[model samples]
Structure formats: C-alpha cells, structure tokens
Target: ERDCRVSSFRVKENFDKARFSGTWYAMAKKDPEGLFLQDNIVAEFSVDETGQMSATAKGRVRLLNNLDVCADMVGTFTDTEDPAKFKMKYHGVASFLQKGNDDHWIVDTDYDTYAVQYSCRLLNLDGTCADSYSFVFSRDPNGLPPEAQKIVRQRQEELCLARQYRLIVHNGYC
Candidate 1:
C-alpha cells in the first residue's frame, strides 16, 4: 500500500520529452469530478524545436439530451522542476467545450510500451486528493501486453486509484 497522499506519489525520473513525442492511445482513465473525456481517446504529442511539449487529443464528449460529440482538445505543457511533472493549459477547439489548466504528470513510462499519467486537481487537508484524474496510455491501440499491464496496475495502486479507473474503448467513433 502507498501513503495514499497526493504529495507521496512518485513520478518518472528524467523524463525525455523528445522520446514521449508520438501517438498515444488512452487505454483507461480515472475521471475527475464531472470531467468526462470519454472513449475513443487518442492523443498526438509533439515537441517543439525549443523542446516545448504540446498535444492534441480527440475523444467523445457527452452533452445534453444524451448527445455525444468528438471533442478536439489542445494542450500545452509547461515543465516544472520535475522532469516528469508539467502544468498543462488545455482547451477544447470549440467554444462550448470545457477549458482550463491542469497538472500533467507522467508517473511512469517505457517510451515504446506504455505510460501512466496522474494529475490531482485539488488537495485535501489530510494530503489526500480531492479531485484527481489519470490516464493510462499505450503506444498501440489494441491494448498493452500483460507485462505492461502489470506495471500500470502497480502504478495505479501507488496513486490510490487502482479501482477508480474506467477502461477507455476505441470504437473508431472519433
């Protein structure tokens, strides 16, 4: 078991932005309070010549009347002291979609296999997270291998979100 505290979580060491630049498919996610980026979530990451990181993601967003639309989201990552941690300013392409800034942390990654990302939107007095979201991404869309899944599950538990995740489906909807 982990400390289950927001401050106790660990992130990737000396994360390489260049290596992380590529296509990624979200395999699962732990949604934040009322935040739904829902299924068919595919992300494309690119690193600028100046080494800035940016990404574009497409996913299904449910609106009123059970309506769903593919949301195109753009995010720019500002590096913190930690190589794996970043402050992400993100917004939807459409005016009606949600927009805000959020923490983007790479908990773990193998560059070519899978990545476990975590972000805490709010903190509690007890050091536990009040609002948090996480994404588990894979290089291949089908799914990660068992070896990678085991590692992802381990990281999920470390973040105190082992049971909070929902599998992200890729139905070619987006």
Candidate 2:
C-alpha cells in the first residue's frame, strides 16, 4: 500500500506570496503516526522586507510529554526559487512543543478561498515518504466552500491520503 511517487508530487503554479499572506484556518488535517497539531488551528503568514515568507501558527496539541496545551510556533522560510516551495525552519515559542525543519510546499491555492499545503518530515531511503502531513486551509473559520472542498478531496486522493484526514474543530483556542 506504499506509493513511492510522493517525491514527484506537484505544487501550485505561479504562486503569489503577497496574495497568500493572510490568516488561514485549518479545516482539515491529515497527520502521520505521531503527536501533532489538534483542532482549533490557525496560521498567519506574511512577507518581510526581504520578501521572505514567515508564519506564526497556533494550535491545540498533545506534546511529547502527553500534556495537552495550545502551542505557538514561529516559522521562517528559505526560498527555493520555485515560488511555491520553501524550506521551513520552525520552533515552539514556549519551549515545549516540537521543532524542526521541513519542506513546505503550496500544493494548490486560489489565494482568496482555500489553500492546500504539504510537508514531509521523513523520506525513506528509496525516496518515498515515511512521515508526511498536509493541511486543508480556508480563509473562513466556518470551513471551505463546496467547490474548494471538492478540489481538496480530489487532491488528497491523488496523494493517496483520501479519507485519512480528520475534521479540525475550531474551538477558539487560538
């Protein structure tokens, strides 16, 4: 059931960082087998004077010590020149949550309504994905519109992660 084509996954074309700079609510998330972000997730993205993408994300999560808390994380991106791909170095603001560097790719986005983001934390020796995550983000906290939902679902299926996502309830924790 392993698909090795993960490395060949495509990304958004002609991504406009300016248009993408805003707040996004995690409507759905597909996580790997580990402790990760929980519901009530929100991320705010911006561009600095140097034109680099940066973000601050807040979400409820269970830390490695098994304590449930809201985590605030800041991420800085290293440009990959592809307009849609970047290397993100992130860390917890409170020193309890997890921190690391990962690939951040905008898989798809309309800039106004919805965005699909993909990241991989681990890759097998053969280049297939070992641990990965993705988010279905929307401009509205209520959730993605029907048309955008269809696109997200279709893209998830293409990534072999259909039905693997959990609905993220925004309980105003952030």
**Which segments of candidate 2 are over 4 A away from where they belong?**
1-4, 64-66
- Per-prediction TM-score, please? 0.97, 0.92
Mind giving the per-residue lDDT tens digits that candidate 1 earns over 7-65?
88999989999999999999999999886687899999999998999999998986544
lDDT of 1: 0.93
- Alpha-carbon local distance difference test for all models: 0.93, 0.86
Q: Clashing residue pairs, candidate 2? A: none
| Candidate number achieving the greatest TM-score relative to the actual structure | 1
> Top lDDT: which candidate number?
1
Give the clash count for model 2. Answer: 0
lDDT, candidate 2, at 95: 74
